Design a protein around this ligand. Structure first.
Ligand SMILES: [Cl-]
Ligand SMILES: [Cl-]
Ligand SMILES: [Cl-]
Ligand SMILES: [Cl-]
Ligand SMILES: [Cl-]
Ligand SMILES: [Cl-]
Ligand SMILES: [Cl-]
Ligand SMILES: [Cl-]
Ligand code: NA
Length: 129
């Protein structure tokens, strides 16, 4: 499922992500934009052999099980395929664990490089929320 911008903002808010660990909703929408272009089915292999999954490109090295990432963990206790659903519940719950891990949203390299310090409120501007 390819979300619209305001549609995804609303779904993220309904699942408790707005201001989670102090990160406003626009930060989360911005990260989703540049990780997946709002596509829940996005996957992207990494050089180390892990794979990133879903709207927030959650990585199999630490966070989900895909059966082909040697030496990895599954700290969200989910199959990585759950992160591709049209229902974003699994991605949101796992992102809450990731953003709590110590470095905040810097865990998402694209958030640091393309969202951090910018006018992230633009990503929710105009939305009925
Ligand atoms: Cl957009
Ligand atoms: Cl917010
Ligand atoms: Cl915002
Ligand atoms: Cl594995
Ligand atoms: Cl584990
Ligand atoms: Cl599994
Ligand atoms: Cl949803
Ligand atoms: Cl933080
Ligand atoms: Na894994």
């Amino acid at each position: 499922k390819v979300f619209g911008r305001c549609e995804l903002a609303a779904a993220m808010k309904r699942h408790g992500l707005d201001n989670y660990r102090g990160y406003s909703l626009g930060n989360w929408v911005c990260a989703a934009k540049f990780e997946s272009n709002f596509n829940t089915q996005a996957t992207n292999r990494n050089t180390d052999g892990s794979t990133d999954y879903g709207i927030l490109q959650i990585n199999s090295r630490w966070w989900c099980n895909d059966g082909r990432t040697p030496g990895s963990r599954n700290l969200c206790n989910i199959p990585c395929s759950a992160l591709l659903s049209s229902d974003i519940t699994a991605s949101v719950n796992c992102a809450k664990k990731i953003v709590s891990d110590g470095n905040g949203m810097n865990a998402w390299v694209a958030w640091r490089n393309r969202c951090k310090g910018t006018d992230v409120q633009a990503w929710i501007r105009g939305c009925r929320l």
